[PDB]
Amino acid sequence: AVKKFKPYTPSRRFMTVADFSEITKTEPEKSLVKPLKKTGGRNNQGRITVRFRGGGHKRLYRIIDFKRWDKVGIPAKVAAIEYDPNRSARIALLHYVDGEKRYIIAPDGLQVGQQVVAGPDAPIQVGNALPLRFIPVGTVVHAVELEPKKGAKLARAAGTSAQIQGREGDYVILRLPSGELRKVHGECYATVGAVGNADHKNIVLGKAGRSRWLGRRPHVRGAAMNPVDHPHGGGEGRAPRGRPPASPWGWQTKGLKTRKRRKPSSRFIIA
Amino acid sequence: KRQVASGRAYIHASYNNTIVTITDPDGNPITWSSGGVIGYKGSRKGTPYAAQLAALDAAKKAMAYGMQSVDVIVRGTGAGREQAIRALQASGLQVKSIVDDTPVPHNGCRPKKK
Amino acid sequence: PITKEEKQKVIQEFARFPGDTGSTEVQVALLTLRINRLSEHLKVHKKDHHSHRGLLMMVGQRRRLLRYLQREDPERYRALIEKLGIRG
């Protein structure tokens, strides 16, 4: 589900590109309340917070709906499968019989014109969103509210899924793409299905621009820096990480459970 | 956990030992004994004699709570099989069920080279 | 799959005189139905390499009667090829 090329150049011997055998012939985003303005790659003091970021391309945001609890009992029709450059998945422009138009992450096996509805009484066909106290066990499900009525904050990149392992009181057991089993409320809205574009990990960027075209600048490595900048200030030659593998600010990056320990959320997890 | 009189037993006879235990009609266990807890070790653990001695240690501390008649659910295939039953069929606690639940599969889990 | 109507509808449209249930004209146009119907099977079940063999038998079987017609009567050959569009 990718498009390799022929080696008329270097780079484009191995580069692969994604599947558009499912995007609705389209290009234009219905410039309603959807497209917004953009920004850049540091902070509010002008000091690079996350390093090795910038450049890239002009992108336009697409207002995605994660709060699928404001259109309960008001069905909707999937209209179109669109590209979004701000997420690994694609998006879906879907039409509501109300006359409204909105956006949802694109799940698997999602067809066009296919009824899709939010609500506790909605069916299990992929696309529909509802609380988890209602979604049965062993169900592929994505876009989860961690806490009720905050928005989908779990499982929403390409190909990601999540099962349902069983109910416990007003709380539900969830398996995330990581591998944690977390207590989440049962009244947290999640949509059913597995996110689309499960082939994103299979792509190949082939060259160096495709790094730069995606904002991700080139990543210099510590063994080349000077001990003013990095611990591993590889002085003479490719001398080694003179113990022990670490980060520009000093903390080792080899197996340091950096997660907080005296944290309330730890009560709700089983790693 | 509670001091009762009715109960249930349990036997597990490996090719090399015969660990046995006992409990109540519920599931809460109280006592157990083995070819080691009798005192033997090594390949002597699989000697039916030793196995016959294991149920004895089990036969006691049950009575040390006040049992009367118990149930016997065997689970295994070795040679400490009957030597616990005969040890348990005649010990002081009459039986009401000579059950066998030896775990026989349906050819699912491929075994070691043995 | 195959119904009765799928049979005689073809047959009477080829039975070169009524009563003809099986002639080299009919045989082909009765295999050629299954072939054209069986090939669109092996399109989805592309891994059924166990049914793919009988087709080559079915095809190669049909390979021979056309070699009988074209041998004996030229005139009935292409006059049957044009009816179903066969062999290219």
Place this chain on the structure above:
Amino acid sequence: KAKVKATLGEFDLRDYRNVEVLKRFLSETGKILPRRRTGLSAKEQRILAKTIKRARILGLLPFTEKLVRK
């Protein structure tokens, strides 16, 4: 110790429900009795197990009754 087969009358062996016509095809544990114990024929047994297994799915028949007194 005899067999069965003729013990029963006109029973539809393709009927995956008349359990009272089957629970004596099961030995004292659930294991289907073999042809050598049911007088059946070749075809007769095959058609039977396919229903025995069927009937075993609807919750009617067991797979392993525990073995009492050996």
Place this chain on the structure above:
Amino acid sequence: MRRYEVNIVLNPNLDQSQLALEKEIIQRALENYGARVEKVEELGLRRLAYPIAKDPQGYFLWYQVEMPEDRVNDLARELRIRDNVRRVMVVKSQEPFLANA
């Protein structure tokens, strides 16, 4: 458009409201799939051998129908969801066979 036999087992610990709520969930389904309802052998509860959903009792149902094959296996998809239902099996019209004739 062939004749199949459907089989439906159901929880017992429920009232004839639910117990009849679900029965229509069956009925107004075969219509949505186009089944010629021929009979029904609502034999009823049976005390199962082994437990299913750790319950040994189940309300049995039955439905010999004549539905198309071009819409069959997708059916139990609509059936095997209702967690009140936890045992479904569909079997072709096995036409009867002689024994001890």
Place this chain on the structure above:
RNA sequence: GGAGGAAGUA
């Protein structure tokens, strides 16, 4: 009678 599916060491 033929046929099918328990040894320590140079």
Place this chain on the structure above:
RNA sequence: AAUGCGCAGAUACCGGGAGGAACGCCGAUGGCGAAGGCAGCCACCUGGUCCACCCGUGACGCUGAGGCGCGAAAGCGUGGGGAGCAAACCGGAUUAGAUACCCGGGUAGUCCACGCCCUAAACGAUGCGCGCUAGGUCUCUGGGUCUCCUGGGGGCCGAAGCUAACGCG
């Protein structure tokens, strides 16, 4: 026996839950396919063969160099899955030593989708097709008013004949 596990609560138990592979009896000496191979149940699609009906075509048949397709297990590439088993690796023990058989762990792999190698004790070490040459005997599968006749298969002794024999029949 030891490595190993185990006072930090195991081995055995009861309740709950997760996750994978593979289907006990039936099951056999049986069936199916060209071979490789194929074993829970249900269903959708699908190939091959066989029996009777006295209907049709009327030699259209057989083999088949080259070609094309399939092809156990192992191995490979890319993504997964991974309960059990387990090459390589480590330790325990036997030993004259043990780079092994016995044991404690254990990665790849065995599982799934796609695309490759295409190899063999691929063996019935028996190419396919047809005709004729005694029988007896259990069995799988059709048919026919039936411990009877007939068609297709798998086993078992054996007529004549063949072989160096074993043996085939």
